[PDB]
Design a binder for this molecule. Structure first.
Ligand code: CL
Ligand code: CL
Ligand code: CL
Length: 290
């Protein structure tokens, strides 16, 4: 028997769960990675089959899990009717009230820390690994992710010190939104890249929010710009913006506009999704810096 400790206290899991609800946005990836097929998955975005993205889809096979959604909040009645022996909500934005409500249905694994959404991915992965008795296997999977990105650095020693920015694929009310240096950007550091500090003065929580008249100046501080774009229309809209259009990156073609899959892979930041980032992204960075 394993005992998981989290923000709301301890959860005792007597044996390996045969019925598992994934009540958060990204958890289905770590569960599938250790070959736990959830009976329910919670949709986030992308409108994927059964809310499982292409990298994890082969693991799903012919399984047809219920698809939940957080639009109105956690649907507990649906989770109750599914009658799970385990509920994983790390990423579901659980609070003290909703947790006890989930605990009534079955043992519930909540987030460990002050982040109700999107705690550091390794913490989420390790927690899931222990809960499903996959702990040794999960450790190997995490180590494999670090290996992949490190191998990119070794293959591209010239990239070291080059400045990059990781940006959302859409403007918010005319403003560029950058991912601040943190665990989310660690995969870029592993490749040897540095996050341009031009975004630091504009920091809000884990994101920089760039005023319009600061956009060109902030972008021009970077050698390569990675926009996480979910469709061709996202890219067109960004290139139509005069600040972005007049940036050095446009003239010098320093822009990387991700595919929906690539954006989703970054967004999920899982043991399954990150390997996709390590494969598909560096060839695009190579054409620019190279
Ligand atoms: Cl660590
Ligand atoms: Cl194991
Ligand atoms: Cl090689």
């Amino acid at each position: 028997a394993v005992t998981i400790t989290h923000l709301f206290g301890q959860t005792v899991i007597k044996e390996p769960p045969k019925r598992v609800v994934s009540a958060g946005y990204t958890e289905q990836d770590d569960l599938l990675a250790v070959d736990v097929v959830p009976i329910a998955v919670t949709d986030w975005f992308g409108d994927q089959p059964f809310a499982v993205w292409p990298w994890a889809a082969p693991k799903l096979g012919g399984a047809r899990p219920a698809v939940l959604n957080l639009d109105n909040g956690i649907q507990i009645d649906r989770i109750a009717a599914l009658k799970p022996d385990l509920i994983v909500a790390i990423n579901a934005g659980v609070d003290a009230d909703t947790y006890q409500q989930l605990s009534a249905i079955a043992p519930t694994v909540a987030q460990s820390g002050g982040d109700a959404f999107f705690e550091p991915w390794k913490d989420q992965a390790r927690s899931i690994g222990q809960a499903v008795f996959a702990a040794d296997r999960m450790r190997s999977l995490i180590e494999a992710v670090d290996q992949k990105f490190a191998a990119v650095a070794q293959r591209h020693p010239r990239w070291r010190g080059k400045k990059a920015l990781l940006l959302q694929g859409r403007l918010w009310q005319g403003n560029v939104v950058a991912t601040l240096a943190g665990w989310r950007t660690d995969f870029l550091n592993d490749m040897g890249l540095v996050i341009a500090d031009s975004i630091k003065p504009f920091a809000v929580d884990q994101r920089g929010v760039i005023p319009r008249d600061h956009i060109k100046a902030v972008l021009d501080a970077a050698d390569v710009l990675i926009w996480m774009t979910e469709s061709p229309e996202d890219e067109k809209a960004l290139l139509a913006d005069p600040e972005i259009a007049a940036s050095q990156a446009t003239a010098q073609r320093r822009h990387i506009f991700t595919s929906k899959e690539q954006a989703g892979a970054i967004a999920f930041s899982s043991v399954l999704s990150y390997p996709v980032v390590a494969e598909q992204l560096p060839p695009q960075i190579s054409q620019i810096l190279g």
